Design a protein around this ligand. Structure first.
Ligand SMILES: *[C@@H]1O[C@H](CO)[C@@H](O)[C@H](O)[C@H]1NC(C)=O
Ligand SMILES: *[C@@H]1O[C@H](CO)[C@@H](O)[C@H](O)[C@H]1NC(C)=O
Ligand SMILES: *[C@@H]1O[C@H](CO)[C@@H](O)[C@H](O)[C@H]1NC(C)=O
Ligand SMILES: *[C@@H]1O[C@H](CO)[C@@H](O)[C@H](O)[C@H]1NC(C)=O
Ligand SMILES: *[C@@H]1O[C@H](CO)[C@@H](O)[C@H](O)[C@H]1NC(C)=O
Lengths: 194, 597
């Protein structure tokens, strides 16, 4: 019986880009959500299936805590039945979404003068994504007909693009960090609640 | 698969490249324009070269796509905006000579310096020398000499330069499949292949022709009144039946007539409306000016400015430790960053210009979500249009009576309102005839219908017939008077101001009639009328994604330029002049000259 280590999850300092969205399985621990709820200092805290409080004393078999960073205006992109770049090619949500989506401003950390370029996101793809899949396979997207043998050039573009993060951005373009907690309800023994 | 999806993919990637490059360049240019330092200019020119070369190579890559093999309009709009190679496509030798022409003429205009015939080492540059020389002075001879000298030093130099400039430019436009370059300047207004909103290049010339046709009587009464007044000011140099001195237009040319207002006050005993001492006594500062402008813009339902705008932008003269080119400008660095740059003092003029720039920035805040190349006005005038309408609104006596800058027991009536009208006239009615004269003059030049050996000669005739100003000096082919002005010498399309002037007043009528206003337009305000604000936003949110005239109709309900907004706006002043001019003439002869003694 241990507390679910949400702490060094929500406020670690190295978050990956969406195209390689990070995921950690949480189980075999007791989970104290209501503290993270009543933190109440986030810029957005939604989810789809339970009141913020009632989820506390109703529990699951396992949960997945995924993290990434996106641009502000695209927080709306992350929700069941949502479309758009980060929704269709980078992070796709199922429609019976069990988890919760928390998102906070991070402009004072993840951006810096000159513009950070560590953070990435995929720009094109032959077709949209399945639910919940990670894709680091990065072969050139074929935009035209001429097979150009893996090079940058005309109708051959690299599927990844670097976010521009200069801290003088509008809130809609300043970076926003996002965590999502996908719960499952299965037949496994007593591994998740608190 | 198809061509069109490929083009959209291309534009997608191009958006997130050009956005970032433009942000870098804009931020660098800003950091320069706020604090004059050398390596700032260095990194600025670096980023600017980056952005420019990137744009050129993108245009070359883009021309690899067929135009008519695309059907979705927006894509065609973006691709015509991008693929137009322009001067870049001509021969590298000729393009280099062209770049030299630009820098040469511009630097001669911006560094030209006139020196009195008595002192070879005491003399004045244009800015701000000749400006005040022509504005604050009442001196006949001073203005005469300054006029001729400034037309002598730079213009006579730049004459063949501008000639060959026109030549290479028309060859360039031919290479762009344009009939000539003035046509290319028109081409921004051109609209193709959309039902109910077609627009030809010559459709524009017809538009401007007709607009000025109905404008004619207003400006004719204006000329009459000013002629009478300056005659009272200069009995030995104005006959009340002819044109006006080309050296007494308050400035070097007659682009604005505000300076003559001081001379032609309609009633020099009624106090003029200003709250400068008032804003002082009430302990205001630039910060509070802009906060009140934000309050106003909220009062029309638009979103208040971004937090980043407040914490980031430079709003006041940054002390005396650093100097900068802080002429009032409003920057949209893209990607959600919007700033205003102005060494804001505290006065009524700053109060107006602050709202002007706030209109600029709000306008840009509207169309953030559109693709890159659409992040600009429906035309090349709507920016200054929205920037001028908010100012015009706030400058009414009543809106000031609202937020407590005027005496709540103020008595506003006939004489003072005609004063305010005639002032705003000299500001805004002034630009119509002069602007149109110059624009169509340059259009004929690009149309080459005028032999070089007669340019100046026909020049003043247009000044003569269309605008009514007489030259003070005999002019042979030694003159290049057009280049004697910034936008000409600096090669800027000059119609945009005429178009802006018309569009703002169409906007004024549209919004006041949509704000359920009753009565005189010249007293109108939009604030607190969320309905009219929503009306305006309904167009602001388009930028230039829709054809511009569709955007205009989304405001006024007329699909074309209309001047009757203007004459209606002024009709108080119109009748007033129609009375004032009973005993004096309107109209002039094309032969007269002050030196035709
Ligand atoms: C991370 O930052 C939040 C503020 O949003 C703070 O409440 C939290 O305590 C920090 N993390 C840790 C482990 O303290
Ligand atoms: C202007 O820029 C220089 C170089 O970045 C800087 O050292 C200086 O402090 C700036 N001016 C002011 C008033 O800070
Ligand atoms: C053009 O494409 C955009 C997005 O690709 C789409 O929203 C729009 O509807 C298209 N144009 C028309 C006329 O449907
Ligand atoms: C801007 O106006 C909105 C309109 O309701 C308001 O909610 C918001 O608080 C204002 N901005 C700030 C920083 O308070
Ligand atoms: C706008 O509405 C507010 C709220 O009543 C009022 O205090 C203010 O005087 C109004 N101003 C104008 C110009 O209507």
């Amino acid at each position: 019986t241990n507390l679910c280590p949400f702490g060094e999850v929500f406020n670690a300092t190295r978050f990956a880009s969406v195209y390689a969205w990070n995921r950690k399985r949480i189980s075999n621990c007791v989970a104290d959500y209501s503290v993270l709820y009543n933190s109440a200092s986030f810029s957005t805290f939604k989810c789809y299936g339970v009141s913020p409080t009632k989820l506390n004393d109703l529990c699951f078999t396992n949960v997945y805590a995924d993290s990434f960073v996106i641009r502000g205006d695209e927080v709306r992109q992350i929700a069941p039945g949502q479309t758009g770049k980060i929704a269709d090619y980078n992070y796709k949500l199922p429609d019976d979404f069990t988890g919760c989506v928390i998102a906070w401003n991070s402009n004072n950390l993840d951006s810096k003068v000159g513009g950070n370029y560590n953070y990435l996101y995929r720009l094109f793809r032959k077709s949209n994504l399945k639910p919940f899949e990670r894709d680091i396979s990065t072969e050139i997207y074929q935009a035209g007909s001429t097979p150009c043998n893996g090079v940058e050039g005309f109708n051959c573009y690299f599927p990844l693009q670097s976010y521009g993060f200069q801290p003088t951005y509008g809130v809609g373009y300043q970076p926003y960090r996002v965590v999502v907690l996908s719960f499952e309800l299965l037949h496994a023994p007593a591994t998740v609640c608190g | 698969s198809t061509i069109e999806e490929q083009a959209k993919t291309f534009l997608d990637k191009f958006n997130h490249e050009a956005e970032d490059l433009f942000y870098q360049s804009s931020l660098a240019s800003w950091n320069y324009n706020t604090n004059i330092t050398e390596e700032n200019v260095q990194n600025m020119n670096n980023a600017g070269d980056k952005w420019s070369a990137f744009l050129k190579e993108q245009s070359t890559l883009a021309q690899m796509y067929p135009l008519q093999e695309i059907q979705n309009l927006t894509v065609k709009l973006q691709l015509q905006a991008l693929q137009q190679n322009g001067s870049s496509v001509l021969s590298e030798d000729k393009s280099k000579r062209l770049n030299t022409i630009l820098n040469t003429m511009s630097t001669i205009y911006s560094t030209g310096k006139v020196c009195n015939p008595d002192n070879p080492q005491e003399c004045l540059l244009l800015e701000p020398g000749l400006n005040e020389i022509m504005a604050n002075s009442l001196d006949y001879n001073e203005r005469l000499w300054a006029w001729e000298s400034w037309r002598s030093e730079v213009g006579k130099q730049l004459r063949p330069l501008y000639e060959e400039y026109v030549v290479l430019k028309n060859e360039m436009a031919r290479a762009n499949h344009y009939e000539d370059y003035g046509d290319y300047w028109r081409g921004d207004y051109e609209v193709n292949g959309v039902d109910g909103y077609d627009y030809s290049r010559g459709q524009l010339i017809e538009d401007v022709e007709h607009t000025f046709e109905e404008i004619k009587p207003l400006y004719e009464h204006l000329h009459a009144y000013v002629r009478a007044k300056l005659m009272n000011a200069y009995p030995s140099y104005i006959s009340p039946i002819g044109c006006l001195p080309a050296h007494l237009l308050g400035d070097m040319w007659g682009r604005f007539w505000t300076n003559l207002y001081s001379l032609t006050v309609p009633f020099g005993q009624k106090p003029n409306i200003d709250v400068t001492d008032a804003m002082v006594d009430q302990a205001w500062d630039a910060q509070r000016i802009f906060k009140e402008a934000e309050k106003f813009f909220v009062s029309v339902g638009l979103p208040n400015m971004t937090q980043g705008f407040w914490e980031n932008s430079m709003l006041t003269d940054p002390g005396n430790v650093q100097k900068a080119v802080c002429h009032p400008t409003a920057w949209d660095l893209g990607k959600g960053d919007f700033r205003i740059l102005m060494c804001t003092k505290v006065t009524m003029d700053d109060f107006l210009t602050a709202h002007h720039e706030m209109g600029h920035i709000q306008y840009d805040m509207a169309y953030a979500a559109q693709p890159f190349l659409l992040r600009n006005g429906a035309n090349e005038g709507f920016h200054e249009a929205v920037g001028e309408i908010m100012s015009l609104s706030a400058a009414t006596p009543k809106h000031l009576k609202s937020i407590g800058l005027l005496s709540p027991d103020f008595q506003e009536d006939n004489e003072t309102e005609i004063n305010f009208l005639l002032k705003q006239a000299l500001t805004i009615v002034g630009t119509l005839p002069f602007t149109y004269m110059l624009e169509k003059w340059r259009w004929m030049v690009f149309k080459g219908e005028i032999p070089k050996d007669q340019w100046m000669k026909k020049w003043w005739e247009m000044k003569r017939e269309i605008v009514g100003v007489v030259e003070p000096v005999p002019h042979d082919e030694t003159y290049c008077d057009p280049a004697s002005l910034f936008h000409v010498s600096n090669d800027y399309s000059f119609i945009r101001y005429y178009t802006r002037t018309l569009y703002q007043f169409q906007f004024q009528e549209a919004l006041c009639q949509a704000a359920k206003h009753e009565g005189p337009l010249h007293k109108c305000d939009i604030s607190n009328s969320t309905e009219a604000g929503q009306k305006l936003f309904n167009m602001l949110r388009l930028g230039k994604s829709e054809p511009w005239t569709l955007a205009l109709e989304n405001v006024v309900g007329a699909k074309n330029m209309n001047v009757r907004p203007l004459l209606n706006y002024f009709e108080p002043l119109f009748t007033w002049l129609k009375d004032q001019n009973k005993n004096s003439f309107v109209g002039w002869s094309t032969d007269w000259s002050p030196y035709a003694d």
